[PDB]
From a paper:
Protein N-glycosylation requires a lipid-linked oligosaccharide (LLO) that acts as a glycan donor of the transfer reaction.
The structure of PglH bound to UDP-GalNAc revealed the molecular details of the interactions with the donor substrate. The uridine moiety is positioned in a pocket formed by α12 and the loop connecting α10 and α11. The 2’ and 3’ hydroxyl groups of the ribose moiety form hydrogen bonds with E275, which is part of the conserved EX7E motif along with E267, which interacts with the N-acetyl group of GalNAc. The pyrophosphate moiety interacts via hydrogen bonds with R191, K196, and T271. The GalNAc unit is located in the cleft formed between the N- and C-terminal domains. Unlike in some structural studies of GT-B enzymes, the saccharide moieties were clearly visible not only for the non-hydrolyzable UDP-CH2-GalNAc, but also for the functional UDP-GalNAc. The structure can explain the specificity of PglH for GalNAc over GlcNAc: whereas the axial hydroxyl group at C4 of GalNAc can be accommodated by the enzyme, an equatorial hydroxyl group (present in GlcNAc) would generate a steric clash with the main chain carbonyl oxygen of L269.
Author numbering: 1 to 360
The structure:
Amino acid sequence: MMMKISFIIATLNSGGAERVLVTLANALCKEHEVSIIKFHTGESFYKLENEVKVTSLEQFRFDTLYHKIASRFKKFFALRKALKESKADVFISFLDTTNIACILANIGLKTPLIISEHSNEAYLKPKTWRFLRRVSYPFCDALSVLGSSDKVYYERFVKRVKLLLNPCHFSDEIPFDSSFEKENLVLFIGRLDHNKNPVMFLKAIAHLDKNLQENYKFVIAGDGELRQELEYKVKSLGIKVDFLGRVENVKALYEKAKVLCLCSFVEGLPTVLIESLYFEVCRISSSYYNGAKDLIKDNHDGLLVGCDDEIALAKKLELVLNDENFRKELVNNAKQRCKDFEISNIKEEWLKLIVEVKNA
Ligand SMILES: CC(=O)N[C@H]1[C@@H](OP(=O)(O)OP(=O)(O)OC[C@H]2O[C@@H](n3ccc(=O)[nH]c3=O)[C@H](O)[C@@H]2O)O[C@H](CO)[C@H](O)[C@@H]1O
Ligand SMILES: [Cl-]
Ligand SMILES: [Cl-]
Ligand SMILES: [K+]
Ligand code: NA
Ligand code: NA
Protein backbone atom coordinates (compact mmCIF):
# COMPACT_ATOMS: atom_id res chain seq x y z
CA MET A 1 0.00 0.00 0.00
CA MET A 2 1.11 3.53 -0.75
CA MET A 3 1.03 6.17 1.94
CA LYS A 4 0.61 9.93 1.66
CA ILE A 5 3.22 11.51 3.96
CA SER A 6 3.16 15.27 4.56
CA PHE A 7 6.16 16.89 6.23
CA ILE A 8 5.87 20.28 7.93
CA ILE A 9 8.90 22.54 8.38
CA ALA A 10 9.39 26.28 8.77
CA THR A 11 11.87 26.70 5.90
CA LEU A 12 13.85 24.58 3.48
CA ASN A 13 17.05 26.49 4.30
CA SER A 14 20.53 25.05 4.86
CA GLY A 15 19.99 23.90 8.46
CA GLY A 16 20.66 20.37 9.61
CA ALA A 17 17.01 19.53 10.19
CA GLU A 18 16.30 20.56 6.60
CA ARG A 19 19.21 18.41 5.40
CA VAL A 20 17.64 15.42 7.18
CA LEU A 21 14.13 16.10 5.87
CA VAL A 22 15.27 16.40 2.25
CA THR A 23 17.16 13.11 2.53
CA LEU A 24 14.07 11.45 4.05
CA ALA A 25 11.69 12.97 1.50
CA ASN A 26 13.88 11.96 -1.44
CA ALA A 27 14.17 8.39 -0.15
CA LEU A 28 10.41 8.01 0.41
CA CYS A 29 9.08 9.87 -2.64
CA LYS A 30 9.10 7.01 -5.17
CA GLU A 31 7.19 4.30 -3.34
CA HIS A 32 5.05 6.80 -1.39
CA GLU A 33 3.40 10.16 -2.07
CA VAL A 34 5.53 12.73 -0.23
CA SER A 35 4.65 16.40 0.25
CA ILE A 36 6.19 19.22 2.28
CA ILE A 37 4.29 22.10 3.89
CA LYS A 38 6.57 25.01 4.73
CA PHE A 39 5.83 28.33 6.39
CA HIS A 40 7.93 30.54 4.09
CA THR A 41 8.55 30.78 0.36
CA GLY A 42 11.86 29.91 -1.28
CA GLU A 43 13.72 27.19 -3.14
CA SER A 44 15.14 24.24 -1.23
CA PHE A 45 18.82 24.79 -0.46
CA TYR A 46 19.28 21.03 -0.68
CA LYS A 47 18.29 19.35 -3.92
CA LEU A 48 14.78 17.90 -3.64
CA GLU A 49 13.46 15.20 -5.97
CA ASN A 50 10.78 16.17 -8.47
CA GLU A 51 8.19 13.76 -7.04
CA VAL A 52 8.18 15.69 -3.77
CA LYS A 53 5.40 18.25 -3.85
CA VAL A 54 6.10 21.52 -2.01
CA THR A 55 3.58 24.11 -0.81
CA SER A 56 4.15 27.34 1.05
CA LEU A 57 1.65 29.02 3.32
CA GLU A 58 0.46 32.49 2.40
CA GLN A 59 2.81 35.29 3.45
CA PHE A 60 1.69 38.13 5.70
CA ARG A 61 2.83 41.54 6.88
CA PHE A 62 4.61 42.03 10.21
CA ASP A 63 5.53 45.73 10.03
CA THR A 64 2.75 47.50 11.96
CA LEU A 65 1.24 46.66 15.33
CA TYR A 66 -2.07 45.58 13.77
CA HIS A 67 -0.29 43.20 11.40
CA LYS A 68 2.07 41.96 14.12
CA ILE A 69 -1.06 40.63 15.88
CA ALA A 70 -3.51 39.82 13.08
CA SER A 71 -0.91 37.98 10.98
CA ARG A 72 0.05 35.63 13.81
CA PHE A 73 -3.58 34.47 13.90
CA LYS A 74 -3.83 34.34 10.09
CA LYS A 75 -0.62 32.29 9.93
CA PHE A 76 -1.97 29.75 12.43
CA PHE A 77 -5.24 29.31 10.54
CA ALA A 78 -3.44 29.10 7.20
CA LEU A 79 -1.59 26.11 8.68
CA ARG A 80 -4.81 24.63 10.06
CA LYS A 81 -6.33 24.99 6.60
CA ALA A 82 -3.36 23.31 4.90
CA LEU A 83 -3.71 20.39 7.33
CA LYS A 84 -7.49 20.11 6.87
CA GLU A 85 -7.16 20.08 3.07
CA SER A 86 -4.24 17.74 3.12
CA LYS A 87 -5.01 14.20 2.31
CA ALA A 88 -1.96 12.94 4.19
CA ASP A 89 -2.15 9.64 6.02
CA VAL A 90 0.39 11.04 8.49
CA PHE A 91 1.89 14.41 9.39
CA ILE A 92 5.57 14.69 10.34
CA SER A 93 6.80 18.05 11.66
CA PHE A 94 10.40 19.17 12.24
CA LEU A 95 11.79 21.44 15.00
CA ASP A 96 10.29 22.33 18.37
CA THR A 97 8.48 25.60 17.65
CA THR A 98 7.03 24.07 14.48
CA ASN A 99 6.07 20.90 16.37
CA ILE A 100 4.14 23.02 18.87
CA ALA A 101 2.35 24.93 16.11
CA CYS A 102 1.34 21.66 14.44
CA ILE A 103 0.04 20.12 17.67
CA LEU A 104 -2.21 23.13 18.25
CA ALA A 105 -3.29 23.46 14.61
CA ASN A 106 -4.09 19.73 14.40
CA ILE A 107 -6.51 19.86 17.36
CA GLY A 108 -9.76 18.20 16.31
CA LEU A 109 -8.44 16.82 13.02
CA LYS A 110 -7.79 13.10 12.84
CA THR A 111 -4.62 12.70 10.76
CA PRO A 112 -1.97 11.51 13.25
CA LEU A 113 1.05 13.73 13.88
CA ILE A 114 4.65 12.61 14.44
CA ILE A 115 6.88 15.35 15.85
CA SER A 116 10.65 15.27 15.35
CA GLU A 117 13.32 16.79 17.61
CA HIS A 118 16.60 17.97 16.06
CA SER A 119 18.58 19.19 19.05
CA ASN A 120 19.23 18.32 22.66
CA GLU A 121 16.28 19.11 24.89
CA ALA A 122 18.48 21.55 26.82
CA TYR A 123 18.92 23.73 23.71
CA LEU A 124 15.49 25.31 24.28
CA LYS A 125 16.22 27.99 26.88
CA PRO A 126 13.19 30.26 27.59
CA LYS A 127 10.97 28.93 30.37
CA THR A 128 7.77 29.81 28.49
CA TRP A 129 8.72 27.67 25.48
CA ARG A 130 9.83 24.80 27.73
CA PHE A 131 6.42 25.06 29.40
CA LEU A 132 4.56 25.00 26.07
CA ARG A 133 6.67 22.02 24.98
CA ARG A 134 5.91 20.21 28.24
CA VAL A 135 2.15 20.68 27.92
CA SER A 136 1.76 20.17 24.14
CA TYR A 137 4.16 17.30 23.36
CA PRO A 138 2.01 14.69 25.22
CA PHE A 139 -0.64 15.23 22.53
CA CYS A 140 1.54 14.08 19.64
CA ASP A 141 1.11 10.55 18.36
CA ALA A 142 4.87 9.87 18.34
CA LEU A 143 8.12 11.75 18.93
CA SER A 144 11.41 11.00 17.19
CA VAL A 145 14.57 11.80 19.16
CA LEU A 146 18.27 11.65 18.33
CA GLY A 147 19.80 10.16 21.49
CA SER A 148 19.05 7.88 24.42
CA SER A 149 19.34 10.81 26.83
CA ASP A 150 16.55 12.78 25.17
CA LYS A 151 14.62 9.50 24.92
CA VAL A 152 14.55 9.17 28.70
CA TYR A 153 13.79 12.88 29.15
CA TYR A 154 10.77 12.87 26.85
CA GLU A 155 9.49 9.40 27.72
CA ARG A 156 8.50 10.75 31.11
CA PHE A 157 5.57 12.68 29.64
CA VAL A 158 5.29 11.34 26.06
CA LYS A 159 3.84 7.88 25.37
CA ARG A 160 5.67 6.89 22.19
CA VAL A 161 9.23 8.14 21.74
CA LYS A 162 11.57 6.50 19.26
CA LEU A 163 15.32 6.94 18.80
CA LEU A 164 15.85 7.55 15.07
CA LEU A 165 19.35 8.42 13.90
CA ASN A 166 19.73 10.84 11.02
CA PRO A 167 20.45 9.42 7.55
CA CYS A 168 23.49 10.87 5.78
CA HIS A 169 23.04 11.40 2.05
CA PHE A 170 26.76 10.80 1.51
CA SER A 171 26.23 7.13 2.42
CA ASP A 172 24.76 6.59 -1.07
CA GLU A 173 27.18 8.79 -3.04
CA ILE A 174 30.73 8.10 -1.79
CA PRO A 175 31.99 4.53 -2.33
CA PHE A 176 33.30 2.94 0.86
CA ASP A 177 36.69 2.19 -0.73
CA SER A 178 37.28 5.77 -1.89
CA SER A 179 40.80 7.13 -1.59
CA PHE A 180 41.56 10.78 -0.93
CA GLU A 181 44.72 12.81 -1.42
CA LYS A 182 44.41 15.25 1.44
CA GLU A 183 45.71 18.80 1.54
CA ASN A 184 46.98 20.75 4.54
CA LEU A 185 43.41 21.83 5.23
CA VAL A 186 41.47 22.24 8.48
CA LEU A 187 37.72 22.86 8.45
CA PHE A 188 35.09 24.49 10.59
CA ILE A 189 31.63 23.94 9.09
CA GLY A 190 28.53 25.39 10.68
CA ARG A 191 26.30 28.31 11.51
CA LEU A 192 28.18 31.25 13.03
CA ASP A 193 26.34 31.79 16.32
CA HIS A 194 27.31 31.62 19.99
CA ASN A 195 26.29 28.00 20.50
CA LYS A 196 28.54 26.80 17.67
CA ASN A 197 31.37 28.83 19.27
CA PRO A 198 33.60 29.53 16.22
CA VAL A 199 35.75 31.87 18.32
CA MET A 200 37.16 28.75 20.01
CA PHE A 201 38.33 27.63 16.57
CA LEU A 202 40.05 30.97 15.92
CA LYS A 203 41.76 31.08 19.32
CA ALA A 204 42.98 27.50 18.89
CA ILE A 205 44.58 28.41 15.55
CA ALA A 206 46.47 31.31 17.12
CA HIS A 207 48.02 28.84 19.60
CA LEU A 208 49.28 26.40 16.95
CA ASP A 209 52.97 26.01 16.20
CA LYS A 210 54.18 28.66 13.84
CA ASN A 211 55.30 25.73 11.61
CA LEU A 212 51.59 24.76 11.27
CA GLN A 213 49.91 28.17 10.91
CA GLU A 214 52.14 29.00 7.92
CA ASN A 215 51.76 25.64 6.13
CA TYR A 216 48.04 24.93 6.67
CA LYS A 217 44.79 26.39 5.37
CA PHE A 218 42.03 27.03 7.92
CA VAL A 219 38.58 27.34 6.37
CA ILE A 220 35.27 28.39 7.92
CA ALA A 221 32.29 27.30 5.81
CA GLY A 222 29.00 28.84 6.92
CA ASP A 223 27.31 32.12 7.81
CA GLY A 224 25.47 33.73 10.69
CA GLU A 225 25.15 36.68 13.02
CA LEU A 226 28.78 36.51 14.18
CA ARG A 227 30.41 36.69 10.71
CA GLN A 228 31.50 40.34 10.96
CA GLU A 229 32.80 40.05 14.52
CA LEU A 230 34.78 36.90 13.65
CA GLU A 231 36.60 38.59 10.76
CA TYR A 232 37.77 41.29 13.18
CA LYS A 233 39.03 38.67 15.64
CA VAL A 234 40.99 37.09 12.79
CA LYS A 235 42.66 40.43 12.20
CA SER A 236 43.30 41.08 15.82
CA LEU A 237 44.81 37.68 16.47
CA GLY A 238 46.98 37.93 13.42
CA ILE A 239 45.93 34.61 11.89
CA LYS A 240 44.88 33.60 8.37
CA VAL A 241 41.38 32.13 8.14
CA ASP A 242 39.30 32.00 4.96
CA PHE A 243 35.58 32.70 5.32
CA LEU A 244 33.80 31.01 2.41
CA GLY A 245 30.35 32.07 3.54
CA ARG A 246 27.66 29.45 3.07
CA VAL A 247 28.93 26.90 0.53
CA GLU A 248 26.87 24.44 -1.51
CA ASN A 249 29.75 22.09 -2.41
CA VAL A 250 30.89 20.92 1.02
CA LYS A 251 31.88 17.63 -0.64
CA ALA A 252 34.91 19.32 -2.21
CA LEU A 253 36.03 20.61 1.20
CA TYR A 254 35.61 17.23 2.91
CA GLU A 255 37.55 15.46 0.15
CA LYS A 256 40.65 17.62 0.63
CA ALA A 257 40.44 18.22 4.39
CA LYS A 258 42.50 16.34 6.97
CA VAL A 259 40.67 17.54 10.10
CA LEU A 260 37.33 19.06 11.10
CA CYS A 261 36.68 20.88 14.38
CA LEU A 262 33.35 21.14 16.20
CA CYS A 263 33.25 23.60 19.12
CA SER A 264 29.58 23.63 20.10
CA PHE A 265 28.19 23.83 23.63
CA VAL A 266 24.94 22.01 22.83
CA GLU A 267 24.19 19.67 19.91
CA GLY A 268 21.64 17.04 19.04
CA LEU A 269 23.44 14.81 16.55
CA PRO A 270 25.85 17.09 14.69
CA THR A 271 25.77 16.45 10.95
CA VAL A 272 29.42 17.36 10.33
CA LEU A 273 30.56 14.62 12.73
CA ILE A 274 28.67 12.15 10.52
CA GLU A 275 29.53 13.55 7.09
CA SER A 276 33.23 13.48 8.03
CA LEU A 277 33.10 9.68 8.34
CA TYR A 278 32.71 9.19 4.58
CA PHE A 279 35.70 11.35 3.57
CA GLU A 280 38.34 10.19 6.09
CA VAL A 281 38.23 13.58 7.83
CA CYS A 282 39.54 13.34 11.38
CA ARG A 283 37.00 14.64 13.88
CA ILE A 284 37.96 16.85 16.82
CA SER A 285 34.99 17.88 18.91
CA SER A 286 34.16 19.65 22.11
CA SER A 287 32.25 17.49 24.57
CA TYR A 288 29.04 19.31 23.75
CA TYR A 289 26.26 18.70 26.24
CA ASN A 290 25.69 15.03 26.30
CA GLY A 291 25.83 13.05 23.03
CA ALA A 292 29.49 13.49 22.11
CA LYS A 293 30.62 10.04 23.22
CA ASP A 294 27.87 8.47 21.10
CA LEU A 295 29.74 9.71 18.00
CA ILE A 296 33.42 9.75 19.04
CA LYS A 297 35.40 7.19 21.01
CA ASP A 298 38.18 9.44 22.29
CA ASN A 299 41.59 8.44 20.83
CA HIS A 300 40.02 5.57 18.83
CA ASP A 301 38.02 7.22 16.02
CA GLY A 302 38.36 10.90 16.93
CA LEU A 303 39.33 13.30 19.68
CA LEU A 304 37.29 15.07 22.36
CA VAL A 305 38.10 18.25 24.28
CA GLY A 306 36.34 20.11 27.04
CA CYS A 307 33.84 22.78 26.11
CA ASP A 308 35.36 26.23 25.48
CA ASP A 309 38.90 24.82 25.92
CA GLU A 310 40.82 26.43 23.07
CA ILE A 311 44.15 25.29 24.55
CA ALA A 312 43.11 21.63 24.48
CA LEU A 313 41.80 22.05 20.93
CA ALA A 314 45.19 23.38 19.82
CA LYS A 315 47.04 20.45 21.40
CA LYS A 316 44.72 17.87 19.81
CA LEU A 317 45.10 19.67 16.48
CA GLU A 318 48.89 19.50 16.78
CA LEU A 319 48.68 15.85 17.83
CA VAL A 320 47.14 14.71 14.52
CA LEU A 321 48.78 17.31 12.27
CA ASN A 322 52.25 16.31 13.56
CA ASP A 323 51.46 12.56 13.31
CA GLU A 324 49.81 11.48 10.05
CA ASN A 325 49.86 7.77 10.94
CA PHE A 326 47.85 8.52 14.09
CA ARG A 327 45.37 10.60 12.09
CA LYS A 328 45.01 7.79 9.54
CA GLU A 329 44.37 5.27 12.32
CA LEU A 330 41.58 7.42 13.78
CA VAL A 331 39.79 7.86 10.46
CA ASN A 332 40.21 4.17 9.59
CA ASN A 333 38.52 3.20 12.86
CA ALA A 334 35.84 5.83 12.22
CA LYS A 335 34.84 4.10 8.97
CA GLN A 336 33.15 1.34 11.00
CA ARG A 337 30.42 3.88 11.84
CA CYS A 338 29.46 4.67 8.23
CA LYS A 339 26.87 1.87 8.29
CA ASP A 340 25.03 3.46 11.23
CA PHE A 341 23.66 6.26 9.04
CA GLU A 342 22.67 4.55 5.78
CA ILE A 343 19.42 5.86 4.31
CA SER A 344 17.92 2.42 3.70
CA ASN A 345 17.76 1.16 7.29
CA ILE A 346 16.66 4.51 8.72
CA LYS A 347 13.93 4.90 6.09
CA GLU A 348 12.40 1.56 7.10
CA GLU A 349 12.41 2.48 10.79
CA TRP A 350 10.46 5.63 9.89
CA LEU A 351 8.01 3.46 7.94
CA LYS A 352 7.74 1.13 10.95
CA LEU A 353 6.93 4.11 13.19
CA ILE A 354 4.36 5.46 10.71
CA VAL A 355 2.64 2.07 10.56
CA GLU A 356 2.69 1.75 14.35
CA VAL A 357 1.06 5.17 14.63
CA LYS A 358 -1.49 4.47 11.87
CA ASN A 359 -2.52 1.18 13.53
CA ALA A 360 -3.17 2.69 16.97
C1 LIG B 1 22.58 22.98 17.86
C2 LIG B 1 21.92 21.74 17.27
O1 LIG B 1 21.29 21.00 17.96
N1 LIG B 1 22.05 21.46 15.86
C3 LIG B 1 21.38 20.24 15.32
C4 LIG B 1 20.63 20.62 14.05
O2 LIG B 1 21.61 20.85 13.12
P1 LIG B 1 22.08 22.39 12.70
O3 LIG B 1 20.94 23.26 12.42
O4 LIG B 1 22.74 23.10 13.78
O5 LIG B 1 23.09 22.30 11.36
P2 LIG B 1 24.29 21.14 11.19
O6 LIG B 1 25.58 21.61 11.70
O7 LIG B 1 24.04 19.96 12.02
O8 LIG B 1 24.36 20.76 9.57
C5 LIG B 1 24.34 21.88 8.73
C6 LIG B 1 24.42 21.40 7.28
O9 LIG B 1 24.53 22.24 6.30
C7 LIG B 1 25.77 22.19 5.92
N2 LIG B 1 26.53 23.36 5.44
C8 LIG B 1 27.14 24.18 6.30
C9 LIG B 1 27.85 25.27 5.82
C10 LIG B 1 27.89 25.47 4.44
O10 LIG B 1 28.50 26.41 3.98
N3 LIG B 1 27.27 24.63 3.63
C11 LIG B 1 26.58 23.58 4.09
O11 LIG B 1 26.02 22.83 3.33
C12 LIG B 1 26.30 20.93 6.25
O12 LIG B 1 27.37 20.28 5.60
C13 LIG B 1 25.19 20.30 6.87
O13 LIG B 1 24.68 19.03 6.53
O14 LIG B 1 19.87 19.48 13.53
C14 LIG B 1 20.82 18.34 13.25
C15 LIG B 1 20.07 17.18 12.71
O15 LIG B 1 19.04 16.79 13.61
C16 LIG B 1 21.67 17.96 14.45
O16 LIG B 1 20.85 17.37 15.47
C17 LIG B 1 22.36 19.15 15.03
O17 LIG B 1 23.07 18.80 16.21
CL1 LIG C 1 23.35 25.57 8.81
CL1 LIG D 1 -1.18 49.64 13.38
K1 LIG E 1 25.34 28.08 7.48
NA1 NA F 1 18.36 22.79 11.81
NA1 NA G 1 27.02 19.68 12.65
